[PDB]
């Protein structure tokens, strides 16, 4: 119970849950280009002088309309990712509220619904300073200072305990079942048959139909929290990183041509901003051209992670010397594109 699960997570009792934390990071890179002998026709027009007036004085706006013709049968240009600069987001632990959000039915006792909100928002990095207005977004309180960069907003997806850790030692889907439009066939309803038909098996691990019954199936606990279709968290500006993993209306809308999905994830549009404070949903105007590997595959990557401070220190040597498991403990060694970068 949301009262009863408050008394245990504070006092140190483990209940029968296990959460899979999902967060998102943004890495400033240094790309390398390549093009060819004539990879693009380029047309320029004639200048136009437009006169405008202003109390300060007369403005002369100048326009020149231009054109682009991509005369490449095949592929004529290459971006190459060379090095890694600073990570923008600090790889930290920012837990997510849903008290910022709005559109969930409260428990009926006003003596107890006020009691929970004053017990979680009070003394939080993220909770609202003022109570949430009926229109518009609630605001995050202004931090007096920052040291590392912006704060990666973590999540908590409720998963059962008895799943294996071996599903997480590999680049996997946090849903527990492999989503995506790349995997489908040439029928009309294959894409929804991937994400929700649980009489068939997972295309990624074929000997089981799912890894999470609480997140993969339709009307699960995972769907009711994080969808674009139900609008639980439509009110808060704070980005939920698994929004692009669960919203089945958006995977089903993408096409299937691998000639074009590879180019369109070289300059896809991100779902976060860098001029924010913690991490925000993007305003409707700004567009940050960020390449998305998670856009194609609907898969997320593991970290160097453990559950002992004692057992994490075996991982700083390298790969073959790190012990993985203890009696009730475990390590997760990363399988990322950051494996040998010492970032």
């Amino acid at each position: 119970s949301p009262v009863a699960l408050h008394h245990q997570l504070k006092t140190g009792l483990h209940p029968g849950f296990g959460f899979t934390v999902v967060r998102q990071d943004r890495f400033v890179t240094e790309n390398v280009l390549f093009s060819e002998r004539a990879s693009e026709a380029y047309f320029l027009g004639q200048l136009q002088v437009a006169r405008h007036e202003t109390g300060g004085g007369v403005n002369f706006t100048l326009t020149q309309p231009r054109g682009n013709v991509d005369l490449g049968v095949g592929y004529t240009a290459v971006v190459a990712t060379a090095t890694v600069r600073n990570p923008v987001t600090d790889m930290g632990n920012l837990p997510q509220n849903f008290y910022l959000g709005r559109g969930a039915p409260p428990l009926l006792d006003n003596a107890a619904a006020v009691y929970l909100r004053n017990a979680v928002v009070a003394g939080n990095r993220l909770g609202p300073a003022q109570p949430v207005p009926v229109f518009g977004c609630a605001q995050v309180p202004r931090r007096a200072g920052m040291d590392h960069g912006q704060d990666a907003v973590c999540e908590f997806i409720a998963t059962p305990v008895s799943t294996d850790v071996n599903y997480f030692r590999r680049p996997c889907n946090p849903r527990g079942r492999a989503a995506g439009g790349v995997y489908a066939g040439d029928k009309e309803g294959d894409v929804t048959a991937l994400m929700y038909d649980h009489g068939q098996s997972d295309p990624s691990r074929a000997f089981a139909a799912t890894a999470n019954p609480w997140a993969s199936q339709r009307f699960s606990y995972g769907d009711l929290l994080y969808n674009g279709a139900y609008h639980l968290n439509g009110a808060s500006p704070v980005l939920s990183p698994c929004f692009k993993f669960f919203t089945s209306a958006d995977i089903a809308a993408k096409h299937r041509c691998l000639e074009r999905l590879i180019v369109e994830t070289g300059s896809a549009v991100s779902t976060a901003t860098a001029a924010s404070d913690v991490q925000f949903k993007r305003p409707p105007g700004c567009r940050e051209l960020v390449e998305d590997p998670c856009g194609l595959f609907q898969e997320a990557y593991p970290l160097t992670c453990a559950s002992d401070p004692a057992l994490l220190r075996s991982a700083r040597n390298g790969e073959a010397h790190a012990r993985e498991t203890h009696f009730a403990q475990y390590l997760v060694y990363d399988a990322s594109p950051l494996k040998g970068l010492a970032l």
């Binding site: 109390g55 706006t61 229109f135 609008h231």
Partner: protein, 308 residues
């Protein structure tokens, strides 16, 4: 020029089919909501895509509350590369005359102030949809002001029902009805507060004298054919007079120096007479036909000069 006119440039994209390009040229005199007074904007800003809240596309009543947070502009010429508009809050043109176009089923006359209303009517929800760009352009309906105070009153009073018919109007003997739809609970409560504040603030110590005139109105309604045609068949003060006999308090504190009725009327004009501007938006616009006709038919243009 800077003062008299202000031309915006709503840019048109590259890839537009000609079934879509020939629909914009029929949108000559319309009403366009800019969010700012920028001189360069795009169609993705004008259209209903930018109109959505966080995830929730609002209904016809919340469609009001995000009008008055924006800037109404009128298209003056549709070029192939851009659409040129003029925001009404700045200034009209050098000549101060911009042609609008009726989307109403209702004729206009001279000197009527125009308020704009959403596409509320049945047989009226005409959204110019561009298929190559996935853009709908929900154009509002220029109505005369004594219609626009009815329809806002029909929509605000309808939501007060569902917190616990009406949709049939009549104007110049022509029957017309407005669409009925379930309302989002959010913007309805933003309308009820703007009622009760401007309603309670219009009540003053002097109003208990005006309340003693209710048996004087009702006893006068049996003699004057003006007061009988005033009160209503379904009014409240007719039923308030047959059951309640009000009488005034005898004395007022410092009742020598102050005027009790004068403070009651000024407080009524600034709060309840102001109320039609606090629900809907302002009637910026009125019709001044010069030589053509005193009555502008539906689907016809009409010249316009600004109103306070």
């Amino acid at each position: 020029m800077l003062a008299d006119g202000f031309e915006t440039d709503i840019a048109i994209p590259s890839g537009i089919s000609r079934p879509d390009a020939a629909a914009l040229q029929r949108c000559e005199g319309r009403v366009v909501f800019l969010p700012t007074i920028r001189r360069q904007l795009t169609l993705a800003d004008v259209a209903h895509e930018s109109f959505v809240s966080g995830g929730v596309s609002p209904d016809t009543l919340g469609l009001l509350l995000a009008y008055r947070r924006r800037f109404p502009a009128v298209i003056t010429r549709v070029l192939p590369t851009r659409i040129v508009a003029c925001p009404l809050d700045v200034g009209l043109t050098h000549a101060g005359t911009v042609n609008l176009r009726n989307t109403s089923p209702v004729d206009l006359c001279n000197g009527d102030p125009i308020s704009l209303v959403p596409p509320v009517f049945e047989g009226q929800a005409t959204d110019v949809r561009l298929d190559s760009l996935d853009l709908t352009l929900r154009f509002p309906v220029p109505l005369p002001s004594p219609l626009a105070r009815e329809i806002v009153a029909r929509l605000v009073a309808r939501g007060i029902r569902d917190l616990n018919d009406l949709n049939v109007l009549y104007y110049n003997g022509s029957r017309l009805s407005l669409l009925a739809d379930v309302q989002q609970l959010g913007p309805v409560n933003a309308e009820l507060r703007s009622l009760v504040l401007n309603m309670v603030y219009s009540i003053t110590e002097g109003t208990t004298i005006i309340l003693t005139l209710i048996p004087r109105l009702f006893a006068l309604s049996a003699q004057d054919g003006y007061v009988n045609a005033l009160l209503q068949m379904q009014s409240v003060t007719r039923e308030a007079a047959q059951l309640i006999h009000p009488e005034a308090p005898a004395l007022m504190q410092d009742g020598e120096r102050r005027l009790p009725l004068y403070e009651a009327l000024v407080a009524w004009l600034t709060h309840a007479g102001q109320l039609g501007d606090t629900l809907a938006l302002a009637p910026v616009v009125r019709v001044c036909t010069f030589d053509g006709a005193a009555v502008v038919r539906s689907g016809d243009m009409a010249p316009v000069i600004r109103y306070p």
